[PDB]
């Protein structure tokens, strides 16, 4: 009592001030750019949209009892906003309810009252044209609730709030949508609600209702509005199609919807990974290991987001199976030190000839390997065991014999020599010619990359690239 | 005092790690145990050693007596504040922190060394104090915190010499350099062995030359390293003294391909018995092998390993699997042959290479402008 | 020792001389410009980071 009593004057007021004012400015400028700013497709409250991405995940989770955030919802949701007098009245209420939080007791809203709080926006000449404003007003019912990470008996109330918000999709698709371009904001809202509603269906069974509804909400894309909704809903579509053990993947390849364009270096980067594992499940053959490296190098700016460890883990797994033999200690993050040990032993016995050591490690750490979702690694890794050795010696000796190259790679028999001399030609793992009159696999080499038109091949795309950059500058300059 | 204080940290840093090899290390480590009044380091070696003749009672009275000989003035001095003058007198820790390191542990040494470092604002004292922090950084092998005071010396402490970093600018090749770094301070940082020997701890005239000779031959192959290893005069005298150093060099330059393994095996025997354990060698032994493979493979595109069976050494199969180890590891650029017994080589052209690099840099910077393109403008 | 532009053949007992083409200059001077372009993109980098 004397210890815990003196320690709650300061905790409440911080969210009471900044958690108060942040979305106040957000809804403010965002509203002014909803009425004005006919080109509000790129709002600076979209960077405030990102600021809300990392804003509530760390700022506030509970409603901050001792009357800090509990009174926010009864204030912020009581928004009638009829005209300038009845809106300057609410402008008064922004400060007027502050005496209610500070002096009085706030309105307790433990994720049960926000649903009945959805009448304050209807009271006193409700506003429906501000479906962005009431849309963030539909995110806020989740914002303390879902971000509290409960998944306990209010998952269903999550679902009901998101049913009202899907009714806000109904309002956009049906109610006063005169080219207001709000779906592309409602597609981000659909994103946020369906990350933690994705988790909601992780804490419960399958999502097939959101599969058909996802094919509908995605169906409306490409016809009237298409920007990041097809992207995000496509990724949510892919994640649990992959998560479930079924065919599930050639349906994705035939899912010819792959080009929702530039995703601001965030959605597109992971997008290459969602598609990347997809191309990986069909025995990827250096075509999508390049896009694995691409995705890993596109948006790494975070700090171990949690799936980034899985892209960093699974990336060179396929390359090991294909041609390469690098380890994965290069980015030995503290975030990686505990996610490296099984894979650490994993890549050693591949290049080393101790396949019994490889089976020892595989039986040793297969549980982690099976937790990684890479069951099919062993069924095709013995492939690149002898292919890795033969790639090594094939690189080493230029005019190597096949009648000698076998006997060094623990082949032990001339018949065993040429079981690898039947597909290496068609594969291209080594460039040589095999003969029976001379059973010697002699390779060769060529030049004229500088004497054949290699450079002007490599240059054209990047020339277009730089002119692209110039076009972006000229298009994104003269705002003032 | 602290000037011969080197050897204790070195032999203690050499003793316990070699388990099979510690007999002489204890035979003289006892000489470093009670003798020299040595108190601080070995008590922390209580669980680090297995046997120890009784030195608790024989020596704790010795650190206690001298500790009583220093702490009585180091904390209350009041020697020159009886008539008038400034409010202090500089006689306390500048004259009594040295025992606070030699017998005072690293803590009582550090608190007084910094306290006098701030007490006397002069680079004159900032010389000896900070360099005691460095030699103690070698003492307790705490080679991370004393990585700080070095650059901290470089910022303000260092300004070009001034009898304080020029006379001791050889506080900067042996004192604080690669114990385990093994990077571009080997060929470049370890070249200007200017003085015959600089005094505090770096022994050019005896064994720093062993450092800079074990490290000289890493810089270049033949853009005239022979002028500074072979035409060098002061190095010519030290090589005149040490034949193993002299033969190992004169082996290397004078196409001594068969004895490269002999002298090389000698110096690797040296690396066996050393203080640098983890950096036993990253690139010494067979980076000198492959170093002999640059000049050996040089100009001999139509080379045969049969000639390798006597010219550079023997064991055609061992040279075989070695070149397999090197060509397959992106090193030793050439194409070696099966039964023909031919050692072929082929480097790129004047355009294949630069194309191969420009394609790299263009991809790097293009990826950069990718991210920075979308950082702004939403 | 670069006193000579030739090549020796152990399996041939043959020396062969060639000519020295110095045509690496443009590719040489191209890369260092990239070396500056990296750091200048840094200069814009901490610019946009310091303020959008």
């Amino acid at each position: 009592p004397p210890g815990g009593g003196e320690q709650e004057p300061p905790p409440p007021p911080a969210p009471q001030d900044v958690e108060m004012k942040e979305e106040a400015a957000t809804g403010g400028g965002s509203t002014g750019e909803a009425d004005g700013k006919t080109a509000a497709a790129a709002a600076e409250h979209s960077q405030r949209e990102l600021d809300t991405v990392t804003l509530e995940d760390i700022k506030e989770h509970v409603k901050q009892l001792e009357k800090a955030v509990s009174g926010k919802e009864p204030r912020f949701v009581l928004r009638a906003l009829r005209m300038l007098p009845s809106t300057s009245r609410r402008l008064n209420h922004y400060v007027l309810y502050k005496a209610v939080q500070g002096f009085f007791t706030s309105n307790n809203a433990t994720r049960d009252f926000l649903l009945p709080f959805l009448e304050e926006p209807m009271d006193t000449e409700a506003d429906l044209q501000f479906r962005p404003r009431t849309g963030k007003a539909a995110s806020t019912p989740l914002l303390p609730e879902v971000e509290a990470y409960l998944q306990l008996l209010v998952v269903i109330f999550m679902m009901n709030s998101k049913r009202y918000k899907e009714a806000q999709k109904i309002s956009d698709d049906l109610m006063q949508k005169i080219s207001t371009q709000n779906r592309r904001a409602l597609d981000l809202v659909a994103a946020k609600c369906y990350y933690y509603h994705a988790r909601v269906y992780e804490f419960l069974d399958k999502l097939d209702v959101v599969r058909s509804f996802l094919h509908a909400r995605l169906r409306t894309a490409t016809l009237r509005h298409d920007a990041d909704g097809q992207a995000t809903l496509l990724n949510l579509l892919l994640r649990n199609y992959l998560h479930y053990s079924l065919y599930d993947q050639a349906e994705k390849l035939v899912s010819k919807s792959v080009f929702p364009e530039q995703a601001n270096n965030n959605e597109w980067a992971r997008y290459l990974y969602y598609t990347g594992r997809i191309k990986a499940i069909q025995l990827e053959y250096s075509e999508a290991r390049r896009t694995m490296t691409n995705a890993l190098r596109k948006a790494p700016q975070h700090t171990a987001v949690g799936f980034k460890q899985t892209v960093h883990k699974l990336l060179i797994v396929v390359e090991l199976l294909l041609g390469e033999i690098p380890d994965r200690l290069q980015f030995r993050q503290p975030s990686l030190k505990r996610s490296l040990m099984p894979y650490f032993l994993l890549t050693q016995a591949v290049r080393t000839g101790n396949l019994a050591k490889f089976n020892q490690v595989l039986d040793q750490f297969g549980e982690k390997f099976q937790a990684d979702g890479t069951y099919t690694l062993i069924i095709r890794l013995r492939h690149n065991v002898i292919k890795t050795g033969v790639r090594m010696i094939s690189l080493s000796y230029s005019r190597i014999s096949l009648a000698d190259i076998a006997q060094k790679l623990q082949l032990d028999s001339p018949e065993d020599a040429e079981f690898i001399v039947a597909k290496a030609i068609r594969d291209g793992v080594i460039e040589a010619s095999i003969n029976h009159e001379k059973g010697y696999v002699q390779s060769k080499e060529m030049i004229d990359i500088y004497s054949t038109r290699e450079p002007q091949l490599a240059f054209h795309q990047r020339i277009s690239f730089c002119l692209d950059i110039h076009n972006m500058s000229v298009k994104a300059m003269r705002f003032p | 005092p602290k000037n011969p204080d080197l050897r204790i940290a070195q032999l203690r840093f050499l003793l316990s790690l070699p388990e099979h090899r510690g007999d002489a290390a204890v035979r003289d480590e006892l000489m470093a145990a009670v003798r020299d009044n040595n108190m601080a380091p070995y008590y922390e070696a209580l669980c680090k050693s297995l046997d120890w003749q009784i030195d608790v009672d024989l020596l704790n009275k010795m650190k206690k007596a001298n500790e009583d000989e220093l702490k009585r003035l180091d904390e209350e001095l009041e020697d020159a504040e009886k008539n008038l003058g400034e409010s202090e007198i500089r006689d306390a820790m500048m004259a009594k922190a040295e025992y606070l390191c030699r017998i005072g542990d690293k803590e009582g040494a550090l608190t007084a060394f910094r306290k006098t470092y701030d007490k006397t604002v002069a680079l004159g004292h900032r010389l000896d104090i900070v360099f005691y922090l460095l030699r103690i950084g070698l003492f307790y092998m705490d080679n991370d915190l004393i990585t700080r005071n070095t650059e901290k010396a470089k910022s303000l402490i260092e300004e070009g010499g001034d009898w304080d970093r020029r006379n001791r600018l050889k506080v900067y090749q042996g004192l604080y350099c690669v114990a385990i770094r093994d990077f571009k301070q080997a060929a470049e940082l370890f070249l200007d062995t200017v003085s015959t020997f600089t005094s505090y701890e770096l022994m050019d005239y005896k064994t720093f030359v062993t450092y800079t000779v074990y490290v000289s031959m890493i810089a270049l192959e033949r853009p005239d390293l022979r002028e500074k290893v072979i035409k060098g005069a002061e190095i010519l005298e030290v090589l005149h003294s040490l034949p193993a150093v002299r033969q190992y060099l004169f082996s290397l330059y004078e196409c001594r391909y068969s004895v490269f393994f002999q002298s090389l095996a000698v110096v690797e025997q040296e690396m066996k018995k050393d203080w640098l354990f983890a950096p036993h060698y990253r690139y010494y032994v067979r980076e000198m092998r492959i170093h002999a493979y640059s000049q050996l493979l040089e100009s001999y595109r139509s080379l045969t390993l049969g000639y390798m069976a006597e010219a550079f050494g023997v064991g055609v199969e061992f040279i075989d699997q070695e070149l397999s180890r090197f060509i397959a590891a992106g090193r030793l650029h050439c194409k070696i042959d099966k039964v023909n017994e031919i050692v072929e080589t082929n480097r790129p052209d004047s355009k294949n290479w630069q194309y191969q690099e420009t394609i790299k840099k263009g991809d790097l910077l293009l990826n950069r402008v990718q991210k920075l393109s979308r950082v702004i403008n939403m | 020792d670069k006193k000579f532009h030739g090549i020796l053949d152990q399996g041939e007992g043959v020396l062969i001389i060639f000519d020295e083409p110095p045509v690496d200059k443009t590719y040489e001077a191209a890369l260092e410009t990239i070396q500056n372009m990296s750091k200048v993109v840094d200069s814009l980098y901490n610019k946009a980071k310091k303020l959008t």
Partner: peptide, 30 residues
């Protein structure tokens, strides 16, 4: 290729240059 390379970056400077002045003068204007 190199010329286009530097030209793109030079064009990219003005994006930061004007995107700074626009919003910084706006937020101070309001």
């Amino acid at each position: 290729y190199l010329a286009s390379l530097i030209r793109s970056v030079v064009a990219l400077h003005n994006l930061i240059n004007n995107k700074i002045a626009n919003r910084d003068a706006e937020k101070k204007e309001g």
